[PDB]
Design a protein around this motif. Structure first.
Motif, PDB file in Angstrom:
ATOM      1  N   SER A   1      54.223  62.420  33.368  1.00 17.61           N
ATOM      2  CA  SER A   1      55.415  61.609  33.531  1.00 17.61           C
ATOM      3  C   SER A   1      55.157  60.556  34.614  1.00 17.61           C
ATOM      4  O   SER A   1      55.305  59.357  34.378  1.00 17.61           O
ATOM      5  CB  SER A   1      56.605  62.500  33.920  1.00 17.61           C
ATOM      6  OG  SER A   1      57.717  61.748  34.393  1.00 17.61           O
TER       7      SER A   1
ATOM      8  N   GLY B   1      59.387  58.343  37.431  1.00 16.79           N
ATOM      9  CA  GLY B   1      59.359  58.819  36.065  1.00 16.79           C
ATOM     10  C   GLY B   1      60.425  59.895  35.980  1.00 16.79           C
ATOM     11  O   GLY B   1      60.634  60.634  36.943  1.00 16.79           O
ATOM     12  N   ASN B   2      61.104  59.983  34.842  1.00 20.49           N
ATOM     13  CA  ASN B   2      62.174  60.956  34.660  1.00 20.49           C
ATOM     14  C   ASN B   2      61.610  62.352  34.689  1.00 20.49           C
ATOM     15  O   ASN B   2      60.470  62.576  34.298  1.00 20.49           O
ATOM     16  CB  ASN B   2      62.884  60.724  33.322  1.00 20.49           C
ATOM     17  CG  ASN B   2      64.324  61.212  33.326  1.00 20.49           C
ATOM     18  OD1 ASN B   2      64.832  61.668  34.349  1.00 20.49           O
ATOM     19  ND2 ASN B   2      64.992  61.104  32.180  1.00 20.49           N
ATOM     20  N   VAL B   3      62.415  63.297  35.135  1.00 22.91           N
ATOM     21  CA  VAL B   3      61.972  64.672  35.199  1.00 22.91           C
ATOM     22  C   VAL B   3      63.214  65.524  35.362  1.00 22.91           C
ATOM     23  O   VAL B   3      64.236  65.028  35.818  1.00 22.91           O
ATOM     24  CB  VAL B   3      60.982  64.868  36.389  1.00 22.91           C
ATOM     25  CG1 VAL B   3      61.649  64.504  37.701  1.00 22.91           C
ATOM     26  CG2 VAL B   3      60.469  66.286  36.406  1.00 22.91           C
TER      27      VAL B   3
ATOM     28  N   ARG C   1      53.185  57.532  33.671  1.00 20.69           N
ATOM     29  CA  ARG C   1      53.838  56.512  32.863  1.00 20.69           C
ATOM     30  C   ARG C   1      54.605  55.608  33.820  1.00 20.69           C
ATOM     31  O   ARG C   1      54.544  54.386  33.720  1.00 20.69           O
ATOM     32  CB  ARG C   1      54.789  57.136  31.847  1.00 20.69           C
ATOM     33  CG  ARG C   1      54.139  58.241  31.045  1.00 20.69           C
ATOM     34  CD  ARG C   1      54.917  58.580  29.781  1.00 20.69           C
ATOM     35  NE  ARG C   1      54.701  57.608  28.705  1.00 20.69           N
ATOM     36  CZ  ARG C   1      53.548  57.435  28.055  1.00 20.69           C
ATOM     37  NH1 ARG C   1      52.484  58.168  28.363  1.00 20.69           N
ATOM     38  NH2 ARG C   1      53.461  56.528  27.091  1.00 20.69           N
ATOM     39  N   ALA C   2      55.311  56.207  34.768  1.00 20.68           N
ATOM     40  CA  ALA C   2      56.063  55.414  35.725  1.00 20.68           C
ATOM     41  C   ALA C   2      55.141  54.448  36.465  1.00 20.68           C
ATOM     42  O   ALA C   2      55.535  53.317  36.764  1.00 20.68           O
ATOM     43  CB  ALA C   2      56.774  56.315  36.713  1.00 20.68           C
TER      44      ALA C   2
END
Lengths: 127, 127, 127, 127
Positions: free
Chosen positions: B17, B94-96, B20-21
């Motif tokens: 993740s 990044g989302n988590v 990607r961020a």
């Protein structure tokens, strides 16, 4: 080797703070991406004036492919549906909140950080 | 008349993740912007290897003015401190999240919408 | 002249924090209120042992009327459905979160305060 | 084992929403617990009048040990400080939020679930 955002959706209620999000969204969408401006219908309905002005500000900011869209019902669900039907890759909104104890305690940290450090916050979804 | 972001700070923990961020953050910082990669220190320390790889990732994405920086103590306060000290105009993560009842119930709506719609979310600060 | 809570729903993943939320929910349900214990199913399924144990701990905490319930699919939507189906008046969860930059940045303030001030937080709905 | 709450704090701004949270906080405070009503100062003084109206509503709700207390500075930090100084074991706020796209998109899930299900939400801290 990611690619630039192709479909940007930005929400606006016409407030001055809201217009800043429209500008930023315009700068990102530019002349190659699609910019969709949305506004929640809370109540020719007044919303159409807000959408029109927002659409004009976007053009002045550099967005060439702009279109307006009223959001009906529970806004977030509508927004998620819009994102899916339009295959959006970026959603934009202007920060906002309440300065009361409850208003602040019930908020989200990202919105809070954004206000605290007068900065923009970007959340990147994971595959 | 809005110009691109100048100082972009992105957070990462080395997971997929986060990478990607980092890619997105690099793509935005490009060549005419400063990209600061941050990572929270929570036990040369293994964090420097993570910061190094992220730094190379940022390079292989187009970011030129890249620099690493370890986050110490409470990460949010530190991050707010870093942005203010570096005049940052964009934070990226990044989302988590957790998929348990509590995990999902205690989160933020922007994080949630980002996941539901598999789209990135941008919060634009106001004056 | 608001009365005591009659139907309490608490979520648990079997962790220690969750069990503390079970004890608190049990203490509130007592002997005159109904206590529904829920757990999200992720994958006799192991979730039933967790539910069974939660039920045992609820009793030892004074809760007389306790029932278990597995939660399926998107957790929050299932929880809202359960609250509506059982006419709940109080939802309870144990605080939890990630300690990475992203984990903290994407959280909610009410959860943050709960951890900050090591205190329980209660949100009272309105009409 | 666990026992009822002893030190309960509740923020309020005088709104109908706040008053409902006051009632609930008082119902919990009862007679063997201290209820601390709080209100943000500068979001015969307007704030003192609110605190007065709250102390009265609280008393009628059944709260014995009540006490007004104005909050200064950033509400959240003050609330966190207040909690530790008074060693509070429970914070209570009335749910509130905006209905615009940004307003809902930028909120927290606990506040959101509370509104969707018209139910109260309790977040139990860990140790």
């Amino acid at each position: 080797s990611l690619s630039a955002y192709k479909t940007v959706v930005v929400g606006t209620d016409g407030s001055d703070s809201s217009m800043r999000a429209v500008d930023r969204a315009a700068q990102i969408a530019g002349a190659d991406a699609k910019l969709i401006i949305a506004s929640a219908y809370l109540p020719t309905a007044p919303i159409y004036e807000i959408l029109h002005d927002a659409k004009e500000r976007a053009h002045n900011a550099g967005a060439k492919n702009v279109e307006e869209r009223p959001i009906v019902g529970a806004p977030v669900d509508a927004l998620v549906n819009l994102a899916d039907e339009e295959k959006a890759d970026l959603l934009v909104v202007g920060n906002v909140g309440l300065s009361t104890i409850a208003g602040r305690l019930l908020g989200s940290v990202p919105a809070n950080v954004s206000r605290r450090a007068k900065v923009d916050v970007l959340i990147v979804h994971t595959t």
